Amino acid sequence: SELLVNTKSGKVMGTRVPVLSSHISAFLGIPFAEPPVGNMRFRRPEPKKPWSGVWNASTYPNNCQQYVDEQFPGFSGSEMWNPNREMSEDCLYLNIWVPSPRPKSTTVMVWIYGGGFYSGSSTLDVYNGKYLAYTEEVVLVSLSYRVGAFGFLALHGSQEAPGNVGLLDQRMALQWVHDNIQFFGGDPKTVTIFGESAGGASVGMHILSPGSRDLFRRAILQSGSPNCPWASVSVAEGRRRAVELGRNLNCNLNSDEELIHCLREKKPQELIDVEWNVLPFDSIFRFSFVPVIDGEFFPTSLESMLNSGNFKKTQILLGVNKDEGSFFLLYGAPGFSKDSESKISREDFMSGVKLSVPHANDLGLDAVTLQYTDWMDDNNGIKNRDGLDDIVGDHNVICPLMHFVNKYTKFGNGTYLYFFNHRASNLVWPEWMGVIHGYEIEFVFGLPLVKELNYTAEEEALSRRIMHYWATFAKTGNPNEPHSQESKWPLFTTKEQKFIDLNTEPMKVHQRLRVQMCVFWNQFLPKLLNAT
Amino acid sequence: SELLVNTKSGKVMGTRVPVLSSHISAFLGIPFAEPPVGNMRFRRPEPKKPWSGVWNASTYPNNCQQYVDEQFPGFSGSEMWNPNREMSEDCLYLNIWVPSPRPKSTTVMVWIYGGGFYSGSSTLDVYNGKYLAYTEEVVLVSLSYRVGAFGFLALHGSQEAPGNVGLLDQRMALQWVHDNIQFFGGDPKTVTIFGESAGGASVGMHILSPGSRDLFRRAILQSGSPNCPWASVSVAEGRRRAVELGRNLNCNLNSDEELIHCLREKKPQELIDVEWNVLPFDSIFRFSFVPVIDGEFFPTSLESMLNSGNFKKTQILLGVNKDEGSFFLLYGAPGFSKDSESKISREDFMSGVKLSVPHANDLGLDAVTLQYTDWMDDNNGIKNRDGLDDIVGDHNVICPLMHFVNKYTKFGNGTYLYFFNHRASNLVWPEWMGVIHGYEIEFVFGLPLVKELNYTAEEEALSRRIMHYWATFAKTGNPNEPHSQESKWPLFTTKEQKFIDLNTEPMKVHQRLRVQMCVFWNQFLPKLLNAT
Ligand SMILES: ONCc1nc(CCCCNc2c3c(nc4ccc(Cl)cc24)CCCC3)ccc1O
Ligand SMILES: ONCc1nc(CCCCNc2c3c(nc4ccc(Cl)cc24)CCCC3)ccc1O
Ligand SMILES: *[C@@H]1O[C@H](CO)[C@@H](O)[C@H](O)[C@H]1NC(C)=O
Ligand SMILES: *[C@@H]1O[C@H](CO)[C@@H](O)[C@H](O)[C@H]1NC(C)=O
Ligand SMILES: *[C@@H]1O[C@H](CO)[C@@H](O)[C@H](O)[C@H]1NC(C)=O
Ligand SMILES: *[C@@H]1O[C@H](CO)[C@@H](O)[C@H](O)[C@H]1NC(C)=O
Ligand SMILES: *[C@@H]1O[C@H](CO)[C@@H](O)[C@H](O)[C@H]1NC(C)=O
Ligand SMILES: *[C@@H]1O[C@H](CO)[C@@H](O)[C@H](O)[C@H]1NC(C)=O
Ligand SMILES: [Cl-]
Ligand SMILES: [Cl-]
Ligand SMILES: [Cl-]
Ligand SMILES: [Cl-]
Ligand SMILES: [Cl-]
Ligand SMILES: [Cl-]
Ligand SMILES: [Cl-]
Ligand SMILES: [Cl-]
Ligand SMILES: [Cl-]
Ligand SMILES: [Cl-]
Ligand SMILES: [Cl-]
Ligand SMILES: [Cl-]
């Protein structure tokens, strides 16, 4: 029977699963590592010891230990991103959706969730890969990885807490797909890794890290890049936050061994309670325990690796959403509220500026405000709100990615670039937030195809277009079907720099995505700060 | 008879002059100072010694000694600005157009010509005040003043060449109008001084200088301001250029007395030949001998005087032309030509940038180019040409004036602001130069009213509108006629910052003239240079 699969680690038994008037196979909660509990907290993951018997693979696993958003209790808009399973340090598991009948060798897609490296779950409703596996005849995997301190506490020079271990969690997941996906009908030679936000940053980090390049074929990055200012810290800064975390918990701080033994003693929620207190009073758009530039996982600085071609050469498909700053501001900036139009005075605009560029001389502040202020209309609350939203999105997401795109394309084997700007008809967040960070995911996973989810027919067609782009790219490295004559999504070349709009209108091709602002962010502003 | 007038200096006899199917009276070439010749070269002017007999005042005087443009021999576009009379150091004379019959007490307007303080003549065809005197029933004076080294050689601490003497030339002209214009039918209580470019800068400098404020009632500034970067130098920089001028002429350089005796010996054209060699290799948009911030004529820095209200409080009417950079670039920038469309490569744009900001760190260069570059279309030769034209005009004219306007309006008694953007139908310079610096003057002086000058009927109506604005402002301090209901030219207030367009279309009112660029020029760029 097709719900039984033998693997190099043991037998697993899945469940038949309905999906749009048909059925497919799902294997939920397969372990890919030893449970990182106890004195293994903060350590590199070990491979899952092989098991006897059949592993019930019919129900979702636990989610990892993480902060939980409570800003809007019961609000579906925020709670659709929270853990929907019991939380535990025993959380290193993957899930697989396999078409029925089982294929023999079809392309594989591995989903890497986001959440700023401090949160995330593979079991969210928007991450349910059954629609995509069934519609595009792919084998859909979603992995999990340790977040927060559990996955990214970095005491460099130590082997009990070296940092980046949540990245090694993902890597082991990919190694297990390389080794066992052939038994699920998947082609381990055509594995596409994809992910959004922190997951998009992860994908790019696996493109960069030599110990990861050989475990996948190509890559998709949504609203995230490895060079994003929130996505990595130095070895010094990682050690500082780790010691600062000990201070918060009354820890002996003389050695790394004593620091680590104390932290291993605390219950997980104790660590999470004080997690945000280690950030520098430098503030707001930054998360505590992120990957570290350690010399091992990342040989040198990300910028030098990028400049020298020191990265896997393949095909990539990536892009951004129109409004990437909205959540940063709602949750952390003064004067933004879920239930008002959040119009913003001149005063509040100037304070959000300062929050958006941590540690910038005053001359830099003027540079930013001069660039984003309409001085013919400088007291317009809506323009001030939109301007701040652009500042935050350009700085933290769009312009890092545009830098990555341009650096990568000089050496890679094909780049495709998209600008997603359709606001979902049924979005529960306020209108002023726009085409929000994170709200293309439901289209990539084909949720518009479910009528009771209350999407427009145009949104079903856009989701089908997008799913087909993603899967056709994963099978062949080109989103366009060969001899099917609809408008072509053109290659992104250093010369032309073309991209497309992704929305419900007929495709349009543009050039040089937000080049005006990103010249400012990627070339002018850092020069200004360097020379003052 | 009305061609004879007795003055506190002697009798003068003018000539009857035809003008648009009528006649008026003109008194050309009245001396207002002692001829500044010989050992009086470079000295403060002395009053004209009174004379016996009748002074023939029927023919134009000489023009002062000055550089003469020969870039386009015979080209009327350039030659209409050159001396049209024999040149001489004996050039301190004024000219008066008096309506017929002679008025008893009507308002007076004193024209101060431009020419970068290195050139200019009161006798140019475009400066012929007969049309304005006759049409608006004013008494029109035009003065003259020493230019070049003869008027602005500045060896501070010396009494034989203190600097600013060409400004004292103008002042003496105004003192003579104060004393004698009542005999020509002019009201010495309603004297309006006006002028363009260097003359506009002069007008503002007389508003600033205490020894000048009491000699006129109000003021008009066209395309010039006292704070313009080409309009003044420091005492140190004036001494440097003066000594450098001696080096060029094999002068003894040990003392000021010996420096000055040598320079007084050279024939005037010898000084003019080497005049441009004293500029710092710092270049292009600067003129050699300009006013100096000496502590006498200007008590303190122009910026501190402006900030503290240390200036005459009255009404002012001022404005700019759409394209102020065109001549700077044509004559001095590489890649601009009279007879091509002067489209400009990316390379040449970057070199014109460097020429437009003398002495700017490289970080400042990027600031300028980032602000004026369209990075979606950065190789457009026309946009690159227009961008450079805006850089030069904003920096050297528009944004200094906008700074002056805003500083003055806090303390003055009424400000009116215009943006002149009608290109004359019959302009002989190439189209790419646009609404050129200097080409509103012919409208202010009513030359469109002469049919054989080949202007459109709309240009006759615009000239009449403008002449009426200027004269009504000069009589009453408000350009609008009281109870005549046509659209009103609104006051310029710190809050609203309104101005009007001056062209052949019906008046329109706008707000915050080029505020985006002038925030960059007047606030951001100097801060950037200061802090690097
Ligand atoms: O974005 N501001 C958020 C914010 N929430 C709160 C509510 C309580 C938890 C603090 N947890 C934080 C969260 C997030 N970012 C943070 C950044 C800096 C710091 Cl000190 C804490 C953060 C973003 C994701 C959600 C939580 C208070 C202050 C505050 O600033
Ligand atoms: O604008 N460039 C002009 C320009 N003309 C020439 C032609 C010969 C005379 C030099 N006379 C000059 C004139 C003017 N500006 C100058 C600025 C710097 C210097 Cl060294 C000389 C200047 C502007 C008004 C007209 C003359 C050569 C080089 C040159 O640069
Ligand atoms: C695991 O499998 C059994 C039958 O194989 C099923 O009844 C059970 O519900 C599954 N586990 C849980 C926790 O429900
Ligand atoms: C990708 O590589 C192959 C062979 O290495 C080459 O022929 C092809 O043109 C490349 N495509 C791009 C877009 O670089
Ligand atoms: C679909 O729309 C109706 C109408 O407001 C709403 O009551 C219902 O809850 C929606 N369904 C879902 C699944 O949100
Ligand atoms: C000055 O006046 C006389 C008559 O008064 C006139 O003939 C003469 O032409 C004038 N001067 C010159 C230089 O022409
Ligand atoms: C000008 O001054 C007079 C009296 O000094 C004052 O009443 C009038 O309002 C002022 N006008 C402006 C525009 O400042
Ligand atoms: C007026 O236009 C004609 C036609 O080109 C021209 O020949 C003539 O010289 C012009 N007149 C003046 C004064 O420029
Ligand atoms: Cl199989
Ligand atoms: Cl514990
Ligand atoms: Cl870049
Ligand atoms: Cl849309
Ligand atoms: Cl919006
Ligand atoms: Cl670019
Ligand atoms: Cl009289
Ligand atoms: Cl001589
Ligand atoms: Cl200003
Ligand atoms: Cl017009
Ligand atoms: Cl133009
Ligand atoms: Cl302003």
Side-chain angles (χ1 to χ4, degrees), chain A residues 377-417:
Chain A
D377 189 9
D378 58 301
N379 274 311
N380 182 326
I382 281 180
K383 288 181 177 168
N384 291 344
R385 182 199 67 212
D386 290 342
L388 215 46
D389 184 298
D390 288 333
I391 285 168
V392 181
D394 294 351
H395 174 60
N396 295 279
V397 173
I398 296 171
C399 293
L401 181 141
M402 285 320 286
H403 183 70
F404 180 84
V405 175
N406 274 302
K407 282 309 194 197
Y408 187 90
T409 281
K410 297 175 176 170
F411 295 103
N413 197 227
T415 296
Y416 296 90
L417 175 65

Tab-separated table of all heavy atoms in Angstrom, chain A residues 377-417:
chain	number	residue	atom	x	y	z
A	377	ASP	N	4.218	69.387	0.448
A	377	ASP	CA	3.027	68.893	1.131
A	377	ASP	C	3.432	68.172	2.423
A	377	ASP	O	2.909	67.102	2.744
A	377	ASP	CB	2.228	67.976	0.191
A	377	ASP	CG	0.856	67.586	0.731
A	377	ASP	OD1	0.416	68.151	1.762
A	377	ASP	OD2	0.214	66.708	0.107
A	378	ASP	N	4.360	68.758	3.183
A	378	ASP	CA	5.099	68.010	4.199
A	378	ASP	C	4.298	67.690	5.459
A	378	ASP	O	4.831	67.009	6.348
A	378	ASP	CB	6.382	68.760	4.584
A	378	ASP	CG	6.112	70.158	5.114
A	378	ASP	OD1	5.503	70.985	4.387
A	378	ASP	OD2	6.517	70.421	6.268
A	379	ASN	N	3.044	68.144	5.566
A	379	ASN	CA	2.199	67.855	6.721
A	379	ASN	C	1.056	66.906	6.384
A	379	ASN	O	0.125	66.765	7.178
A	379	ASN	CB	1.647	69.145	7.319
A	379	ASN	CG	2.599	69.764	8.313
A	379	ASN	OD1	3.102	69.076	9.206
A	379	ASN	ND2	2.876	71.059	8.155
A	380	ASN	N	1.117	66.247	5.229
A	380	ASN	CA	0.116	65.259	4.838
A	380	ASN	C	0.299	63.994	5.675
A	380	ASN	O	1.281	63.264	5.504
A	380	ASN	CB	0.255	64.970	3.343
A	380	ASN	CG	-0.779	63.988	2.823
A	380	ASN	OD1	-1.192	63.061	3.522
A	380	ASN	ND2	-1.196	64.182	1.570
A	381	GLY	N	-0.658	63.715	6.564
A	381	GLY	CA	-0.555	62.533	7.410
A	381	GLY	C	-0.450	61.226	6.641
A	381	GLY	O	0.194	60.279	7.101
A	382	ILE	N	-1.075	61.147	5.468
A	382	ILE	CA	-1.059	59.898	4.719
A	382	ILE	C	0.277	59.709	4.000
A	382	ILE	O	0.861	58.620	4.017
A	382	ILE	CB	-2.246	59.862	3.741
A	382	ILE	CG1	-3.525	59.502	4.497
A	382	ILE	CG2	-1.975	58.897	2.599
A	382	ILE	CD1	-4.754	59.439	3.623
A	383	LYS	N	0.777	60.765	3.355
A	383	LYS	CA	2.103	60.704	2.751
A	383	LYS	C	3.171	60.422	3.796
A	383	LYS	O	4.121	59.674	3.539
A	383	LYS	CB	2.409	62.004	2.013
A	383	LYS	CG	1.608	62.168	0.734
A	383	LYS	CD	1.978	63.454	0.041
A	383	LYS	CE	1.237	63.593	-1.263
A	383	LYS	NZ	1.383	64.971	-1.792
A	384	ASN	N	3.042	61.016	4.977
A	384	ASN	CA	4.001	60.725	6.033
A	384	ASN	C	3.908	59.269	6.460
A	384	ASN	O	4.929	58.639	6.763
A	384	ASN	CB	3.783	61.657	7.225
A	384	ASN	CG	4.160	63.103	6.909
A	384	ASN	OD1	4.858	63.370	5.924
A	384	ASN	ND2	3.704	64.042	7.744
A	385	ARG	N	2.696	58.712	6.489
A	385	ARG	CA	2.554	57.308	6.842
A	385	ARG	C	3.149	56.424	5.753
A	385	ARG	O	3.939	55.515	6.034
A	385	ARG	CB	1.082	56.975	7.073
A	385	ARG	CG	0.808	55.539	7.487
A	385	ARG	CD	-0.646	55.169	7.245
A	385	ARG	NE	-0.989	55.128	5.825
A	385	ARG	CZ	-2.187	55.428	5.329
A	385	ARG	NH1	-3.171	55.818	6.127
A	385	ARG	NH2	-2.405	55.352	4.027
A	386	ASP	N	2.793	56.697	4.495
A	386	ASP	CA	3.307	55.910	3.382
A	386	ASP	C	4.820	56.047	3.256
A	386	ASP	O	5.518	55.062	2.986
A	386	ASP	CB	2.606	56.327	2.088
A	386	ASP	CG	1.141	55.901	2.054
A	386	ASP	OD1	0.773	55.010	2.852
A	386	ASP	OD2	0.355	56.453	1.244
A	387	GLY	N	5.347	57.256	3.464
A	387	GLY	CA	6.785	57.451	3.383
A	387	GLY	C	7.541	56.614	4.396
A	387	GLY	O	8.498	55.915	4.060
A	388	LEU	N	7.113	56.665	5.655
A	388	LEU	CA	7.712	55.807	6.671
A	388	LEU	C	7.581	54.326	6.310
A	388	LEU	O	8.475	53.527	6.607
A	388	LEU	CB	7.055	56.095	8.014
A	388	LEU	CG	7.907	56.021	9.267
A	388	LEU	CD1	9.217	56.752	9.041
A	388	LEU	CD2	7.132	56.627	10.456
A	389	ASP	N	6.463	53.934	5.697
A	389	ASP	CA	6.288	52.535	5.328
A	389	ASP	C	7.299	52.136	4.254
A	389	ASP	O	7.841	51.023	4.280
A	389	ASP	CB	4.847	52.307	4.852
A	389	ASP	CG	4.543	50.840	4.543
A	389	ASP	OD1	5.187	50.268	3.621
A	389	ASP	OD2	3.659	50.253	5.217
A	390	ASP	N	7.568	53.046	3.311
A	390	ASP	CA	8.577	52.816	2.288
A	390	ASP	C	9.981	52.811	2.877
A	390	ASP	O	10.805	51.967	2.512
A	390	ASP	CB	8.453	53.875	1.194
A	390	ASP	CG	7.218	53.676	0.332
A	390	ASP	OD1	6.747	52.522	0.205
A	390	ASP	OD2	6.721	54.671	-0.230
A	391	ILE	N	10.285	53.747	3.775
A	391	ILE	CA	11.603	53.741	4.409
A	391	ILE	C	11.882	52.377	5.024
A	391	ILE	O	12.922	51.757	4.765
A	391	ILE	CB	11.709	54.861	5.460
A	391	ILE	CG1	11.858	56.221	4.782
A	391	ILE	CG2	12.879	54.624	6.388
A	391	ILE	CD1	11.679	57.426	5.738
A	392	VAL	N	10.932	51.866	5.806
A	392	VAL	CA	11.194	50.641	6.547
A	392	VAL	C	11.316	49.464	5.597
A	392	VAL	O	12.158	48.582	5.791
A	392	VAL	CB	10.107	50.399	7.604
A	392	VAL	CG1	10.397	49.140	8.378
A	392	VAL	CG2	10.013	51.586	8.564
A	393	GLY	N	10.493	49.439	4.552
A	393	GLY	CA	10.522	48.311	3.643
A	393	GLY	C	11.738	48.331	2.742
A	393	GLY	O	12.376	47.299	2.528
A	394	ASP	N	12.066	49.504	2.195
A	394	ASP	CA	13.258	49.644	1.377
A	394	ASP	C	14.496	49.224	2.151
A	394	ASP	O	15.302	48.414	1.673
A	394	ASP	CB	13.389	51.084	0.885
A	394	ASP	CG	12.272	51.469	-0.061
A	394	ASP	OD1	11.499	50.568	-0.457
A	394	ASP	OD2	12.149	52.668	-0.393
A	395	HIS	N	14.642	49.742	3.363
A	395	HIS	CA	15.857	49.499	4.120
A	395	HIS	C	16.006	48.032	4.495
A	395	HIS	O	17.079	47.450	4.310
A	395	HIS	CB	15.869	50.354	5.366
A	395	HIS	CG	17.016	50.059	6.268
A	395	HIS	ND1	18.325	50.191	5.862
A	395	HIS	CD2	17.056	49.634	7.552
A	395	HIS	CE1	19.124	49.862	6.862
A	395	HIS	NE2	18.379	49.524	7.900
A	396	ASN	N	14.949	47.416	5.032
A	396	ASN	CA	15.101	46.104	5.649
A	396	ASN	C	14.860	44.936	4.704
A	396	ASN	O	15.218	43.804	5.049
A	396	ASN	CB	14.155	45.954	6.837
A	396	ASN	CG	14.476	46.909	7.954
A	396	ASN	OD1	15.384	46.660	8.750
A	396	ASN	ND2	13.743	48.021	8.020
A	397	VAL	N	14.253	45.163	3.541
A	397	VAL	CA	13.864	44.052	2.686
A	397	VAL	C	14.178	44.342	1.226
A	397	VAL	O	14.994	43.640	0.610
A	397	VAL	CB	12.373	43.707	2.848
A	397	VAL	CG1	11.976	42.661	1.822
A	397	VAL	CG2	12.069	43.211	4.257
A	398	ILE	N	13.525	45.351	0.640
A	398	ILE	CA	13.589	45.481	-0.817
A	398	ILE	C	15.012	45.778	-1.273
A	398	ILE	O	15.541	45.118	-2.176
A	398	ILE	CB	12.600	46.540	-1.321
A	398	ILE	CG1	11.183	46.082	-1.002
A	398	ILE	CG2	12.767	46.740	-2.820
A	398	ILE	CD1	10.137	47.112	-1.261
A	399	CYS	N	15.661	46.744	-0.648
A	399	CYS	CA	16.971	47.113	-1.179
A	399	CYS	C	18.088	46.121	-0.853
A	399	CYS	O	19.039	46.011	-1.638
A	399	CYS	CB	17.360	48.509	-0.705
A	399	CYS	SG	16.306	49.792	-1.405
A	400	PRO	N	18.056	45.414	0.284
A	400	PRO	CA	18.986	44.282	0.428
A	400	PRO	C	18.809	43.248	-0.671
A	400	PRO	O	19.798	42.799	-1.277
A	400	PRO	CB	18.642	43.733	1.816
A	400	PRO	CG	18.206	44.947	2.573
A	400	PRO	CD	17.411	45.743	1.568
A	401	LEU	N	17.558	42.888	-0.971
A	401	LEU	CA	17.298	41.885	-1.996
A	401	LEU	C	17.757	42.369	-3.363
A	401	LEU	O	18.368	41.609	-4.128
A	401	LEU	CB	15.807	41.534	-2.011
A	401	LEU	CG	15.297	40.483	-2.997
A	401	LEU	CD1	14.216	39.587	-2.357
A	401	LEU	CD2	14.795	41.127	-4.289
A	402	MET	N	17.466	43.627	-3.695
A	402	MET	CA	17.941	44.162	-4.966
A	402	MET	C	19.460	44.163	-5.035
A	402	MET	O	20.026	44.028	-6.124
A	402	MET	CB	17.409	45.575	-5.191
A	402	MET	CG	15.959	45.620	-5.580
A	402	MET	SD	15.591	44.300	-6.724
A	402	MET	CE	16.361	44.903	-8.236
A	403	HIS	N	20.138	44.340	-3.898
A	403	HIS	CA	21.590	44.222	-3.905
A	403	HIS	C	22.003	42.777	-4.161
A	403	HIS	O	22.900	42.508	-4.968
A	403	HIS	CB	22.165	44.721	-2.587
A	403	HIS	CG	23.665	44.710	-2.530
A	403	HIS	ND1	24.447	45.576	-3.268
A	403	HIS	CD2	24.525	43.959	-1.796
A	403	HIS	CE1	25.721	45.355	-2.995
A	403	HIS	NE2	25.797	44.380	-2.105
A	404	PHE	N	21.348	41.837	-3.474
A	404	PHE	CA	21.624	40.427	-3.671
A	404	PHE	C	21.413	40.041	-5.126
A	404	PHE	O	22.311	39.481	-5.761
A	404	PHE	CB	20.743	39.593	-2.738
A	404	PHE	CG	20.953	38.111	-2.881
A	404	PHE	CD1	21.976	37.475	-2.196
A	404	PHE	CD2	20.134	37.357	-3.712
A	404	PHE	CE1	22.185	36.111	-2.336
A	404	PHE	CE2	20.334	35.991	-3.855
A	404	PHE	CZ	21.363	35.369	-3.166
A	405	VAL	N	20.255	40.404	-5.688
A	405	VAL	CA	19.929	40.087	-7.079
A	405	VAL	C	21.047	40.521	-8.014
A	405	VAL	O	21.493	39.761	-8.882
A	405	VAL	CB	18.605	40.756	-7.487
A	405	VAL	CG1	18.341	40.535	-8.957
A	405	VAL	CG2	17.476	40.184	-6.697
A	406	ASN	N	21.488	41.768	-7.877
A	406	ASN	CA	22.466	42.279	-8.825
A	406	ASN	C	23.809	41.599	-8.641
A	406	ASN	O	24.462	41.240	-9.627
A	406	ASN	CB	22.580	43.790	-8.695
A	406	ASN	CG	21.538	44.508	-9.534
A	406	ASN	OD1	21.482	44.320	-10.760
A	406	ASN	ND2	20.681	45.312	-8.883
A	407	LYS	N	24.214	41.366	-7.392
A	407	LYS	CA	25.477	40.682	-7.153
A	407	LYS	C	25.429	39.241	-7.661
A	407	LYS	O	26.394	38.761	-8.263
A	407	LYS	CB	25.829	40.727	-5.666
A	407	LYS	CG	26.397	42.064	-5.192
A	407	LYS	CD	27.551	42.513	-6.074
A	407	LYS	CE	28.346	43.644	-5.443
A	407	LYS	NZ	29.189	44.319	-6.461
A	408	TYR	N	24.304	38.548	-7.445
A	408	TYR	CA	24.203	37.147	-7.828
A	408	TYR	C	24.194	36.980	-9.340
A	408	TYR	O	24.811	36.048	-9.866
A	408	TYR	CB	22.949	36.502	-7.223
A	408	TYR	CG	22.905	34.994	-7.454
A	408	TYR	CD1	23.473	34.122	-6.537
A	408	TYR	CD2	22.315	34.452	-8.589
A	408	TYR	CE1	23.459	32.754	-6.743
A	408	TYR	CE2	22.296	33.075	-8.806
A	408	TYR	CZ	22.873	32.235	-7.877
A	408	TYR	OH	22.884	30.868	-8.059
A	409	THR	N	23.497	37.869	-10.055
A	409	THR	CA	23.230	37.655	-11.476
A	409	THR	C	24.503	37.687	-12.321
A	409	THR	O	24.551	37.041	-13.381
A	409	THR	CB	22.189	38.687	-11.940
A	409	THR	OG1	20.887	38.249	-11.529
A	409	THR	CG2	22.170	38.884	-13.451
A	410	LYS	N	25.550	38.375	-11.851
A	410	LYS	CA	26.833	38.363	-12.550
A	410	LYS	C	27.409	36.952	-12.685
A	410	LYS	O	28.131	36.672	-13.643
A	410	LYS	CB	27.831	39.272	-11.829
A	410	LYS	CG	27.408	40.733	-11.804
A	410	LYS	CD	28.371	41.584	-10.981
A	410	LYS	CE	27.997	43.065	-11.041
A	410	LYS	NZ	28.776	43.889	-10.069
A	411	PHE	N	27.100	36.049	-11.757
A	411	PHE	CA	27.707	34.729	-11.759
A	411	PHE	C	26.729	33.577	-11.931
A	411	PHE	O	27.162	32.476	-12.296
A	411	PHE	CB	28.491	34.502	-10.459
A	411	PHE	CG	29.679	35.411	-10.292
A	411	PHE	CD1	29.623	36.499	-9.442
A	411	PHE	CD2	30.861	35.159	-10.968
A	411	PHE	CE1	30.725	37.328	-9.271
A	411	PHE	CE2	31.961	35.983	-10.804
A	411	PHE	CZ	31.891	37.071	-9.951
A	412	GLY	N	25.443	33.781	-11.683
A	412	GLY	CA	24.492	32.693	-11.710
A	412	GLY	C	24.102	32.278	-13.110
A	412	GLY	O	24.566	32.812	-14.117
A	413	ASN	N	23.200	31.299	-13.160
A	413	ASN	CA	22.798	30.656	-14.401
A	413	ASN	C	21.363	30.992	-14.785
A	413	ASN	O	20.747	30.272	-15.581
A	413	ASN	CB	22.990	29.143	-14.284
A	413	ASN	CG	22.987	28.446	-15.632
A	413	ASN	OD1	22.326	27.430	-15.811
A	413	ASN	ND2	23.717	28.991	-16.588
A	414	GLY	N	20.821	32.082	-14.242
A	414	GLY	CA	19.462	32.487	-14.537
A	414	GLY	C	18.754	33.068	-13.333
A	414	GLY	O	18.665	32.417	-12.286
A	415	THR	N	18.251	34.294	-13.474
A	415	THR	CA	17.548	35.006	-12.412
A	415	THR	C	16.187	35.454	-12.924
A	415	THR	O	16.100	36.032	-14.011
A	415	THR	CB	18.346	36.221	-11.952
A	415	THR	OG1	19.579	35.791	-11.365
A	415	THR	CG2	17.540	37.044	-10.928
A	416	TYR	N	15.133	35.185	-12.152
A	416	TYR	CA	13.798	35.711	-12.427
A	416	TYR	C	13.310	36.524	-11.227
A	416	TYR	O	13.452	36.084	-10.081
A	416	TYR	CB	12.824	34.575	-12.755
A	416	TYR	CG	13.175	33.823	-14.026
A	416	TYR	CD1	14.011	32.709	-13.998
A	416	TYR	CD2	12.662	34.223	-15.252
A	416	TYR	CE1	14.341	32.028	-15.161
A	416	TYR	CE2	12.974	33.550	-16.412
A	416	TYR	CZ	13.815	32.450	-16.369
A	416	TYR	OH	14.123	31.779	-17.541
A	417	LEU	N	12.730	37.702	-11.482
A	417	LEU	CA	12.413	38.664	-10.423
A	417	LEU	C	10.971	39.147	-10.537
A	417	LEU	O	10.531	39.542	-11.623
A	417	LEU	CB	13.376	39.858	-10.478
A	417	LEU	CG	13.074	40.989	-9.482
A	417	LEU	CD1	13.246	40.496	-8.047
A	417	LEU	CD2	13.946	42.217	-9.752
